[PDB]
Design a protein around this ligand. Structure first.
Ligand SMILES: [Mg+2]
Ligand SMILES: [Mg+2]
Ligand SMILES: [Mg+2]
Ligand SMILES: [Mg+2]
Ligand SMILES: [Mg+2]
Ligand SMILES: [Mg+2]
Ligand SMILES: [Mg+2]
Ligand SMILES: [Mg+2]
Ligand SMILES: [Mg+2]
Ligand SMILES: [Mg+2]
Ligand SMILES: [Mg+2]
Ligand SMILES: [Mg+2]
Ligand SMILES: [Mg+2]
Ligand SMILES: [Mg+2]
Ligand SMILES: [Mg+2]
Ligand SMILES: [Mg+2]
Ligand SMILES: [Mg+2]
Ligand SMILES: [Mg+2]
Ligand SMILES: [Mg+2]
Ligand SMILES: [Mg+2]
Ligand SMILES: [Mg+2]
Ligand SMILES: [Mg+2]
Ligand SMILES: [Mg+2]
Ligand SMILES: [Mg+2]
Ligand SMILES: [Mg+2]
Ligand SMILES: [Mg+2]
Ligand SMILES: [Mg+2]
Ligand SMILES: [Mg+2]
Ligand SMILES: [Mg+2]
Ligand SMILES: [Mg+2]
Ligand SMILES: [Mg+2]
Ligand SMILES: [Mg+2]
Ligand SMILES: [Mg+2]
Ligand SMILES: [Mg+2]
Ligand SMILES: [Mg+2]
Ligand SMILES: [Mg+2]
Ligand SMILES: [Mg+2]
Ligand SMILES: [Mg+2]
Ligand SMILES: [Mg+2]
Ligand SMILES: [Mg+2]
Ligand SMILES: [Mg+2]
Ligand SMILES: [Mg+2]
Ligand SMILES: [Mg+2]
Ligand SMILES: [Mg+2]
Ligand SMILES: [Mg+2]
Ligand SMILES: [Mg+2]
Ligand SMILES: [Mg+2]
Ligand SMILES: [Mg+2]
Ligand SMILES: [Mg+2]
Ligand SMILES: [Mg+2]
Ligand SMILES: [Mg+2]
Ligand SMILES: [Mg+2]
Ligand SMILES: [Mg+2]
Ligand SMILES: [Mg+2]
Ligand SMILES: [Mg+2]
Ligand SMILES: [Mg+2]
Ligand SMILES: [Mg+2]
Ligand SMILES: [Mg+2]
Ligand SMILES: [Mg+2]
Ligand SMILES: [Mg+2]
Ligand SMILES: [Mg+2]
Ligand SMILES: [Mg+2]
Ligand SMILES: [Mg+2]
Ligand SMILES: [Mg+2]
Ligand SMILES: [Mg+2]
Ligand SMILES: [Mg+2]
Ligand SMILES: [Mg+2]
Ligand SMILES: [Mg+2]
Ligand SMILES: [Mg+2]
Ligand SMILES: [Mg+2]
Ligand SMILES: [Mg+2]
Ligand SMILES: [Mg+2]
Ligand SMILES: [Mg+2]
Ligand SMILES: [Mg+2]
Ligand SMILES: [Mg+2]
Ligand SMILES: [Mg+2]
Ligand SMILES: [Mg+2]
Ligand SMILES: [Mg+2]
Ligand SMILES: [Mg+2]
Ligand SMILES: [Mg+2]
Ligand SMILES: [Mg+2]
Ligand SMILES: [Mg+2]
Ligand SMILES: [Mg+2]
Ligand SMILES: [Mg+2]
Ligand SMILES: [Mg+2]
Ligand SMILES: [Mg+2]
Ligand SMILES: [Mg+2]
Ligand SMILES: [Mg+2]
Ligand SMILES: [Mg+2]
Ligand SMILES: [Mg+2]
Ligand SMILES: [Mg+2]
Ligand SMILES: [Mg+2]
Ligand SMILES: [Mg+2]
Ligand SMILES: [Mg+2]
Ligand SMILES: [Mg+2]
Ligand SMILES: [Mg+2]
Ligand SMILES: [Mg+2]
Ligand SMILES: [Mg+2]
Ligand SMILES: [Mg+2]
Ligand SMILES: [Mg+2]
Ligand SMILES: [Mg+2]
Ligand SMILES: [Mg+2]
Ligand SMILES: [Mg+2]
Ligand SMILES: [Mg+2]
Ligand SMILES: [Mg+2]
Ligand SMILES: [Mg+2]
Ligand SMILES: [Mg+2]
Ligand SMILES: [Mg+2]
Ligand SMILES: [Mg+2]
Ligand SMILES: [Mg+2]
Ligand SMILES: [Mg+2]
Ligand SMILES: [Mg+2]
Ligand SMILES: [Mg+2]
Ligand SMILES: [Mg+2]
Ligand SMILES: [Mg+2]
Ligand SMILES: [Mg+2]
Ligand SMILES: [Mg+2]
Ligand SMILES: [Mg+2]
Ligand SMILES: [Mg+2]
Ligand SMILES: [Mg+2]
Ligand SMILES: [Mg+2]
Ligand SMILES: [Mg+2]
Ligand SMILES: [Mg+2]
Ligand SMILES: [Mg+2]
Ligand SMILES: [Mg+2]
Ligand SMILES: [Mg+2]
Ligand SMILES: [Mg+2]
Ligand SMILES: [Mg+2]
Ligand SMILES: [Mg+2]
Ligand SMILES: [Mg+2]
Ligand SMILES: [Mg+2]
Ligand SMILES: [Mg+2]
Ligand SMILES: [Mg+2]
Ligand SMILES: [Mg+2]
Ligand SMILES: [Mg+2]
Ligand SMILES: [Mg+2]
Ligand SMILES: [Mg+2]
Ligand SMILES: [Mg+2]
Ligand SMILES: [Mg+2]
Ligand SMILES: [Mg+2]
Ligand SMILES: [Mg+2]
Ligand SMILES: [Mg+2]
Ligand SMILES: [Mg+2]
Ligand SMILES: [Mg+2]
Ligand SMILES: [Mg+2]
Ligand SMILES: [Mg+2]
Ligand SMILES: [Mg+2]
Ligand SMILES: [Mg+2]
Ligand SMILES: [Mg+2]
Ligand SMILES: [Mg+2]
Ligand SMILES: [Mg+2]
Ligand SMILES: [Mg+2]
Ligand SMILES: [Mg+2]
Ligand SMILES: [Mg+2]
Ligand SMILES: [Mg+2]
Ligand SMILES: [Mg+2]
Ligand SMILES: [Mg+2]
Ligand SMILES: [Mg+2]
Ligand SMILES: [Mg+2]
Ligand SMILES: [Mg+2]
Ligand SMILES: [Mg+2]
Ligand SMILES: [Mg+2]
Ligand SMILES: [Mg+2]
Ligand SMILES: [Mg+2]
Ligand SMILES: [Mg+2]
Ligand SMILES: [Mg+2]
Ligand SMILES: [Mg+2]
Ligand SMILES: [Mg+2]
Ligand SMILES: [Mg+2]
Ligand SMILES: [Mg+2]
Ligand SMILES: [Mg+2]
Ligand SMILES: [Mg+2]
Ligand SMILES: [Mg+2]
Ligand SMILES: [Mg+2]
Ligand SMILES: [Mg+2]
Ligand SMILES: [Mg+2]
Ligand SMILES: [Mg+2]
Ligand SMILES: [Mg+2]
Ligand SMILES: [Mg+2]
Ligand SMILES: [Mg+2]
Ligand SMILES: [Mg+2]
Ligand SMILES: [Mg+2]
Ligand SMILES: [Mg+2]
Ligand SMILES: [Mg+2]
Ligand SMILES: [Mg+2]
Ligand SMILES: [Mg+2]
Ligand SMILES: [Mg+2]
Ligand SMILES: [Mg+2]
Ligand SMILES: [Mg+2]
Ligand SMILES: [Mg+2]
Ligand SMILES: [Mg+2]
Ligand SMILES: [Mg+2]
Ligand SMILES: [Mg+2]
Ligand SMILES: [Mg+2]
Ligand SMILES: [Mg+2]
Ligand SMILES: [Mg+2]
Ligand SMILES: [Mg+2]
Ligand SMILES: [Mg+2]
Ligand SMILES: [Mg+2]
Ligand SMILES: [Mg+2]
Ligand SMILES: [Mg+2]
Ligand SMILES: [Mg+2]
Ligand SMILES: [Mg+2]
Ligand SMILES: [Mg+2]
Ligand SMILES: [Mg+2]
Ligand SMILES: [Mg+2]
Ligand SMILES: [Mg+2]
Ligand SMILES: [Mg+2]
Ligand SMILES: [Mg+2]
Ligand SMILES: [Mg+2]
Ligand SMILES: [Mg+2]
Ligand SMILES: [Mg+2]
Ligand SMILES: [Mg+2]
Ligand SMILES: [Mg+2]
Ligand SMILES: [Mg+2]
Ligand SMILES: [Mg+2]
Ligand SMILES: [Mg+2]
Ligand SMILES: [Mg+2]
Ligand SMILES: [Mg+2]
Ligand SMILES: [Mg+2]
Ligand SMILES: [Mg+2]
Ligand SMILES: [Mg+2]
Ligand SMILES: [Mg+2]
Ligand SMILES: [Mg+2]
Ligand SMILES: [Mg+2]
Ligand SMILES: [Mg+2]
Ligand SMILES: [Mg+2]
Ligand SMILES: [Mg+2]
Ligand SMILES: [Mg+2]
Ligand SMILES: [Mg+2]
Ligand SMILES: [Mg+2]
Lengths: 275, 48
RNA sequence: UGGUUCGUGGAGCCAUGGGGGAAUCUGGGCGGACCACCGCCUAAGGCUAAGUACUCCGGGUGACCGAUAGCGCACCAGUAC
RNA sequence: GAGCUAGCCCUGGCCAGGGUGAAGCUGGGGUGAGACCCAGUGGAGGCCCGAACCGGUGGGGGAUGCAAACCCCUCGGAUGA
RNA sequence: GAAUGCCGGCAUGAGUAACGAUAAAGAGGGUGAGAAUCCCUCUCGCCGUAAGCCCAAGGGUUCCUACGCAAUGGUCGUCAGCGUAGGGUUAGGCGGGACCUAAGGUGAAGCCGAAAGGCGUAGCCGAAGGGCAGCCGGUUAAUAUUCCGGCCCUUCCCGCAGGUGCGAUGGGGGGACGCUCUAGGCUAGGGGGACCGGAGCCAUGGACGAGCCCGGCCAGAAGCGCAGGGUGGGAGGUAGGCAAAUCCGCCUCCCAACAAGCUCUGCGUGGUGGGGAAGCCCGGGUGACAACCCCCCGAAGCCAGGGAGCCAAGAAAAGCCUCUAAGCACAACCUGCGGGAACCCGUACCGCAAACCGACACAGGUGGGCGGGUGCAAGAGCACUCAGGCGCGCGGGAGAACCCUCGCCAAGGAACUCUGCAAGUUGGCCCCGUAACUUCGGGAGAAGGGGUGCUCCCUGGGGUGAUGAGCCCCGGGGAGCCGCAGUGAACAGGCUCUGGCGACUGUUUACCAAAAACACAGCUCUCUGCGAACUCGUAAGAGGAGGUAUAGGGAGCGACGCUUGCCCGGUGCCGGAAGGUCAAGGGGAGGGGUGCAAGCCCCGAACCGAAGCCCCGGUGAACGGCGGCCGUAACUAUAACGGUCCUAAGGUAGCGAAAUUCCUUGUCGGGUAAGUUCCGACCUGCACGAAAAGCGUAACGACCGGAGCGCUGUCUCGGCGAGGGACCCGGUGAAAUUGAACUGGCCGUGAAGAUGCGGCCUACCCGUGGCAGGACGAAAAGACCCCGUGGAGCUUUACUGCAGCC
RNA sequence: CGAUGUCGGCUCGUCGCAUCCUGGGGCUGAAGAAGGUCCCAAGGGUUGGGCUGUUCGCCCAUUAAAGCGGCACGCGAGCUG
RNA sequence: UGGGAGAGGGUGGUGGAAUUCCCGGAGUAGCGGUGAAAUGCGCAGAUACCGGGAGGAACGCCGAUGGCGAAGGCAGCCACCUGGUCCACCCGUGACGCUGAGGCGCGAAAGCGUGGGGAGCAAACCGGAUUAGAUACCCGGGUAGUCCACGCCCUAAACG
RNA sequence: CCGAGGGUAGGGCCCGUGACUGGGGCGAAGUCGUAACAAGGUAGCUGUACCGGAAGGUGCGGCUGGAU
């Protein structure tokens, strides 16, 4: 559920927050956290290379295990599910029987007290990790590697998932969260289930301040600027765009495709995204 | 109101200091010039 | 592409970023597209005094200044500020 | 040249007193169970009043100033972007 | 001789403005050549969440003393932050370094770049963060947690004793963390005391009193007590913590568990050491053998790493504990004791300011801590006041205009004016009471009203005690007293109605705009499959993001409600293996130059040959666009209807004289005696209209309109009064400006607005306070306008190129 | 154009007379009262308010009357803005 | 107590037919559509045919003048949870009953909020026809919606 | 003290009236079309929804109070 508020200030009227119902442990695992170097959107030259970032709550980085093929056959107990400020998904605390502890992103349905495992022989159940070639076609899966041994890259955002659609030689064919149809290699790991916290998308920030907490600084329309600044700048009074609507840097921004044409992975993308 | 000189000794040495000047081709050329000119002080005097 | 007086010109020569790519004197480059003839010269390794430039420095000399001039400074000045 | 100013980064510090009284929780009532209602408790919030602090609305004064942007009166924010 | 020339000197304005907060002064004494200004005393006033005190920056001798007064000081000066000299800053425990890491910086490895140079995991640097051992008093002219005294403590070296598998830069624990709220017990700090100690006092009508006035503490090892923090113990397994590990992690079992124990801290006590007032005598003496006790209040501080709740989910590293590795186990490490050892830098003084930033001893600016008492509901607010510190480095008179700041005002009460601009009114707390509308929160402090002092009597509950007394807190009821008046002073909302805009708190043009502008939650379009797109960079490398389509970029719109129509011909974007065009290159029919020749060299048609463009289609919350004429209805008028030209299609819903309406003060209605504004309507909309969104919308607004009540010196319409200036006298003493001047009025004249020319008129010489008509007054080589084949910012389907992309 | 500050208002006037009123008069289609029209006359007077930035104008209520012009569209080293 | 029938309700699964689109193959000049046509689609290779895939929706035959429910209404198959109801036995209770103003719940479709989903169909809308005209009927397109979850709405020729 | 009433302020219900505006009834001598009644020339009606000069149309679902 998302949580509502009575309109006892003008902002609480529309603000909603997550319910955090799945959360069972309110403090990170000290050996699995490290400091996050906050950037402001500035690169190593000092220059802002991404606008309007800065000023959010402080965060510790929780180290996530996006490999998992790292510990084949060694099962683990799900110790706790926790809040993770670095992602929309919650994260799950794993206690391997080995004694090693790691985090994974928490799939929808994962229960604390339950066991998970990774490897070619893992049961096809929620929370387990296997190479794609061993997962029954039709099953929905998350945290997918894009190339073998290179780490989970696909379906990690709250509520996302890919579904295995079929196989072809060394590859299986997934339907990505975008609806893109892609061949991923059969040897790539993936975890059965969808990512949790699926109500994430229904949160209503509610006030300027809450974006401010997220490290999102105010964003300013090209229209509200001047010609030195932006193609849409200037003009006396309000103005329509007066040219094809553009980015600050002049490239067109309603429709112009931008994916590089001759890119090697084109050979592996079967169908571009939907809608 | 708050004016523009707000002395700070560390800021002065880190910024205009002898070592700062040497670290850079441009800064070393300031020293070349101030030496060629006979400057008594090549670098802001600062108390330390 | 640069260099040359040569700004694409009939544009050779010298140099070379890209591609191709030899020969050892019956070899090669050159004499302003190119060809012939007639000549000149020996590429793709290196060094080499002197005659030449300059004036922080020392000295000599002015139909040069003479303290608002002459160096910014005749003086504790690249100082005070 | 960011010792002013603008943004961001790291690490610290500050915000009198007063008011309103969200969720929850407890008890009562209600019902098949419920929703829900009432009371108490609770103490939320770019909530309220108002110092510090941050501002600079209106007016007057200043105008070779006290000041190359000040003064008095008034006024905005004051747990938060 | 002129360049608003340059440099310098000296005039003018002028004995003029001014002498820098309106907190405020007076007198007596001293000193000295000289005194409003220096010292001393008494009186007066100001600050007192400071205008007192302590730290950090910055400053750099300004500190203290002696001797000085040319200059510096807005006056004076005997004085001084000034001149000369002399002195003065003392640390194992404070701060920083011989400790740690943060951003960031630098940088073995490594990467990149014409050179210079740019990056870069480790490492190193980097602190106001972490770590770390000192408290109280005394002393100097001037330093003191530094010297001294007293009581405590840290590390290193060595040794002795006891103990133990010792050993690390490697493994682990820990260090270690948010915001709001908050419990218990303390402490700081404070109030009272009939109790304790004290020099003394009885005035002026009364008081020898349970009188007045003054004080009634500080630090302290172990032990002890109180309150807290931290923390389970044993055993077995073990494949993880890039070696090892008995540690840590994981599994199992046993005992313990809102206990304890152990351990660390706070506080109390505690051997001891210190301090110790008023007043009175000259900083010191005394008071004094000072007393040093009880009760109440009580933190934002401490115990602390406490507790709850919440979402935005809250540094690192060392110290420290533990584990083992090379080793070494006569070693080494731990514990206790003893002796020795313990370096460098800072330390003066200013520090909300006359010593810092503002050219000035400048009404400005400057981070942290302390910041007493009483009353006012509270408070860091306000008034007064303690300690402490000040009267602001020109004064003395006078009592005009005028100006500033301030107080009052008959009758009227907005008639003022662009505007109630400004000033009134209102004003705190308690109680009663409170509308439309609403998103059900609100609107609300709506509005409006009543109460408010003191005295006596009765009485309810809480805290501290003990259950009681005393003390402190929150009330209730009764009877009365006084004044014009009881938040009696000071601090402290005027209100209502109705429209526009913007939902809202926020942001902005530092220094003429705070807004309706920007932002904002929220809505849509679009790009992006991850070595993402995108941005910065030549590159390497970064950001994006240690993120992964519930994510990231770009764009527009702007809470929310009801909505968002038609046109894809043009431009854009998307899609389109056809077709047309299409460069280098390929190809080489054919042709040429030259040579005796082989040959060498040149031109070159067909034809093959990308993107782009053409072309075909899509696409509007992509750029954009969204008609005209003729006729027609029982009288006129109008035209539901018909016809016709044009177009890519001809404006839908809603709204409409509008932040848009030219004509225009449209017309009609409302409000007023009177309404170019305002509100409601109408609709021939010059020239609204649906995300450059349309129409609404509760709540909000130092936004912009219109009206009403309240109340006023805004006004009829002005008067009086106050203080600071203006004025006079002493002191000090500017400025712009200035061709020179012996510088009147009229009517004319003149380059067309005359002190300066003509004619007339008028007029003795020279000032002071005032007024502003003129000197086309001053300032600023007009900012508008034009001109210059002058500049610069910006735009695009101007030209031409470049990055970038294909 | 090396600057002659610009609308309206306020304040302060002063002048012209082609006179709004008041005084004198001729003609009248002047019985009277009241008017019209012209002439002489500038001594004095010439109101308060609603609208609008307005000047102007319209309007309310009065009046003997509610004059029109000049003075750099009088007057910003006099104020406003 | 023992038995029965049934698209009664809820959840979870799950099968094949068809349509659509995508991929491969093969193939050529039309297909489609109507009263007849046109728009549309098709030599940029459509239609028709084969194989592969994706996806949503509805469940042909059985099927009925059938069944179940209070009504709205309910239909592939499977399991689980669950209501109503009928029969037989004549075992138990001993009038414990009927109706029911208010109240409470359920209530087709369309519609609405948030989020999914979207093959076919299809208001609005575009275009072709028909026609005197044709904002219709018919033809080619087409968005809400139709579908799912959760919350609303509370109507009906909700009829026997 | 209470007290007729007076005054101030804010509420509630009712009636009259109002620029303008929405439909309604009627009149009828008109314009436009022909929606229903026949299979009414697209069976009708229906709740809802979107739409159109107008009766109306179409979608979805329902009823027969449908002709053949
Ligand atoms: Mg809410
Ligand atoms: Mg709620
Ligand atoms: Mg509210
Ligand atoms: Mg709100
Ligand atoms: Mg959760
Ligand atoms: Mg959940
Ligand atoms: Mg935490
Ligand atoms: Mg760590
Ligand atoms: Mg990180
Ligand atoms: Mg860096
Ligand atoms: Mg950006
Ligand atoms: Mg940024
Ligand atoms: Mg999370
Ligand atoms: Mg969330
Ligand atoms: Mg969203
Ligand atoms: Mg955050
Ligand atoms: Mg954003
Ligand atoms: Mg914006
Ligand atoms: Mg703008
Ligand atoms: Mg702008
Ligand atoms: Mg710029
Ligand atoms: Mg530009
Ligand atoms: Mg531009
Ligand atoms: Mg523009
Ligand atoms: Mg424009
Ligand atoms: Mg603009
Ligand atoms: Mg304009
Ligand atoms: Mg415009
Ligand atoms: Mg603009
Ligand atoms: Mg424009
Ligand atoms: Mg536009
Ligand atoms: Mg345009
Ligand atoms: Mg790939
Ligand atoms: Mg500063
Ligand atoms: Mg410093
Ligand atoms: Mg510093
Ligand atoms: Mg600094
Ligand atoms: Mg330096
Ligand atoms: Mg020297
Ligand atoms: Mg230098
Ligand atoms: Mg030529
Ligand atoms: Mg050449
Ligand atoms: Mg070469
Ligand atoms: Mg030869
Ligand atoms: Mg040869
Ligand atoms: Mg050669
Ligand atoms: Mg030659
Ligand atoms: Mg030669
Ligand atoms: Mg020689
Ligand atoms: Mg030589
Ligand atoms: Mg000289
Ligand atoms: Mg010299
Ligand atoms: Mg000189
Ligand atoms: Mg000198
Ligand atoms: Mg110098
Ligand atoms: Mg911090
Ligand atoms: Mg605050
Ligand atoms: Mg709530
Ligand atoms: Mg609770
Ligand atoms: Mg607030
Ligand atoms: Mg507030
Ligand atoms: Mg104050
Ligand atoms: Mg101001
Ligand atoms: Mg005011
Ligand atoms: Mg002024
Ligand atoms: Mg000024
Ligand atoms: Mg003030
Ligand atoms: Mg105020
Ligand atoms: Mg605020
Ligand atoms: Mg406030
Ligand atoms: Mg706020
Ligand atoms: Mg001359
Ligand atoms: Mg001059
Ligand atoms: Mg000069
Ligand atoms: Mg000069
Ligand atoms: Mg004078
Ligand atoms: Mg003067
Ligand atoms: Mg002065
Ligand atoms: Mg003074
Ligand atoms: Mg004053
Ligand atoms: Mg004196
Ligand atoms: Mg003297
Ligand atoms: Mg003195
Ligand atoms: Mg100094
Ligand atoms: Mg000193
Ligand atoms: Mg002197
Ligand atoms: Mg002197
Ligand atoms: Mg003297
Ligand atoms: Mg002086
Ligand atoms: Mg001075
Ligand atoms: Mg003397
Ligand atoms: Mg001094
Ligand atoms: Mg010591
Ligand atoms: Mg050492
Ligand atoms: Mg270090
Ligand atoms: Mg430190
Ligand atoms: Mg101590
Ligand atoms: Mg000393
Ligand atoms: Mg031991
Ligand atoms: Mg260790
Ligand atoms: Mg941590
Ligand atoms: Mg910390
Ligand atoms: Mg103490
Ligand atoms: Mg007290
Ligand atoms: Mg083990
Ligand atoms: Mg004593
Ligand atoms: Mg004694
Ligand atoms: Mg680190
Ligand atoms: Mg040393
Ligand atoms: Mg010291
Ligand atoms: Mg101050
Ligand atoms: Mg300066
Ligand atoms: Mg002074
Ligand atoms: Mg008070
Ligand atoms: Mg108070
Ligand atoms: Mg004074
Ligand atoms: Mg006088
Ligand atoms: Mg009066
Ligand atoms: Mg009034
Ligand atoms: Mg009145
Ligand atoms: Mg007004
Ligand atoms: Mg008050
Ligand atoms: Mg009302
Ligand atoms: Mg309400
Ligand atoms: Mg009130
Ligand atoms: Mg009294
Ligand atoms: Mg006061
Ligand atoms: Mg107030
Ligand atoms: Mg109102
Ligand atoms: Mg308006
Ligand atoms: Mg606003
Ligand atoms: Mg705004
Ligand atoms: Mg709104
Ligand atoms: Mg908004
Ligand atoms: Mg806002
Ligand atoms: Mg400005
Ligand atoms: Mg400004
Ligand atoms: Mg400026
Ligand atoms: Mg200003
Ligand atoms: Mg402004
Ligand atoms: Mg404002
Ligand atoms: Mg703005
Ligand atoms: Mg805005
Ligand atoms: Mg919106
Ligand atoms: Mg770039
Ligand atoms: Mg990189
Ligand atoms: Mg990163
Ligand atoms: Mg991301
Ligand atoms: Mg905006
Ligand atoms: Mg509404
Ligand atoms: Mg239309
Ligand atoms: Mg178009
Ligand atoms: Mg188009
Ligand atoms: Mg165009
Ligand atoms: Mg073909
Ligand atoms: Mg040939
Ligand atoms: Mg167009
Ligand atoms: Mg547009
Ligand atoms: Mg007619
Ligand atoms: Mg209109
Ligand atoms: Mg009007
Ligand atoms: Mg309007
Ligand atoms: Mg406007
Ligand atoms: Mg308009
Ligand atoms: Mg108009
Ligand atoms: Mg107009
Ligand atoms: Mg008019
Ligand atoms: Mg108006
Ligand atoms: Mg106006
Ligand atoms: Mg009209
Ligand atoms: Mg726009
Ligand atoms: Mg607009
Ligand atoms: Mg638009
Ligand atoms: Mg509107
Ligand atoms: Mg509104
Ligand atoms: Mg506002
Ligand atoms: Mg405002
Ligand atoms: Mg007055
Ligand atoms: Mg007075
Ligand atoms: Mg006076
Ligand atoms: Mg006076
Ligand atoms: Mg005199
Ligand atoms: Mg003369
Ligand atoms: Mg003249
Ligand atoms: Mg004259
Ligand atoms: Mg003369
Ligand atoms: Mg005369
Ligand atoms: Mg004058
Ligand atoms: Mg004047
Ligand atoms: Mg003159
Ligand atoms: Mg003048
Ligand atoms: Mg010039
Ligand atoms: Mg000029
Ligand atoms: Mg000019
Ligand atoms: Mg001109
Ligand atoms: Mg030209
Ligand atoms: Mg010319
Ligand atoms: Mg030019
Ligand atoms: Mg230019
Ligand atoms: Mg691009
Ligand atoms: Mg001019
Ligand atoms: Mg001038
Ligand atoms: Mg002038
Ligand atoms: Mg003007
Ligand atoms: Mg008569
Ligand atoms: Mg008569
Ligand atoms: Mg007269
Ligand atoms: Mg006269
Ligand atoms: Mg007017
Ligand atoms: Mg007018
Ligand atoms: Mg008369
Ligand atoms: Mg004129
Ligand atoms: Mg004028
Ligand atoms: Mg004027
Ligand atoms: Mg002026
Ligand atoms: Mg004027
Ligand atoms: Mg003037
Ligand atoms: Mg003048
Ligand atoms: Mg004046
Ligand atoms: Mg049946
Ligand atoms: Mg029986
Ligand atoms: Mg229903
Ligand atoms: Mg439905
Ligand atoms: Mg529907
Ligand atoms: Mg039926
Ligand atoms: Mg009466
Ligand atoms: Mg019909
Ligand atoms: Mg029909
Ligand atoms: Mg029509
Ligand atoms: Mg239709
Ligand atoms: Mg039915």
């Amino acid at each position: 559920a998302v949580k509502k508020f009575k309109p006892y200030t003008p902002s609480r009227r529309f603000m909603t927050v997550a319910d955090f119902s799945e959360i069972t442990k309110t403090e990170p695992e000290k050996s699995l956290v490290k400091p996050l170097k906050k950037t402001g959107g500035r690169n190593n030259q000092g220059r802002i290379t991404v606008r309007f970032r800065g000023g959010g709550h402080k965060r510790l980085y929780r180290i996530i295990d996006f490999k998992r093929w790292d510990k084949v056959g060694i099962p683990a107990k799900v110790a706790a599910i926790e809040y993770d400020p670095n992602r929309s998904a919650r994260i799950a605390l794993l206690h391997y029987v080995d004694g090693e502890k790691r985090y994974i992103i928490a799939p929808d349905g994962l229960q604390v007290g339950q066991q998970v495992v990774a490897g070619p022989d893992a049961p096809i159940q929620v929370g387990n990790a296997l190479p794609l070639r061993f997962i029954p076609v039709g099953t929905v899966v998350h945290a997918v590697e894009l190339e073998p041994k290179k780490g989970a890259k696909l379906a990690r955002a709250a509520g996302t998932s890919a579904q295995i659609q079929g196989r072809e030689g060394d590859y299986v064919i997934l339907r990505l969260p975008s609806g893109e149809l892609r061949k991923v290699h059969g040897e790539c790991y993936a975890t059965v289930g969808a990512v949790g916290n699926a109500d994430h998308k229904n949160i209503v920030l509610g006030k300027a301040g809450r974006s401010r907490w997220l490290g999102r600084r105010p964003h300013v329309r090209g229209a509200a600027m001047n010609p030195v600044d932006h193609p849409h700048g200037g003009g006396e009074g309000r103005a329509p765009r007066g040219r094809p609507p553009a980015s600050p840097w002049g490239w067109q921004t309603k429709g112009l495709k931008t994916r590089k044409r001759r890119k090697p992975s084109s050979r592996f993308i079967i169908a571009r995204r939907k809608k | 109101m708050k004016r523009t000189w707000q002395p700070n000794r560390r800021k002065r040495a880190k910024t205009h200091g002898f070592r700062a000047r040497m670290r850079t081709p441009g800064g070393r050329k300031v020293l070349k010039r101030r030496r060629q000119k006979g400057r008594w002080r090549l670098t802001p005097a600062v108390r330390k």
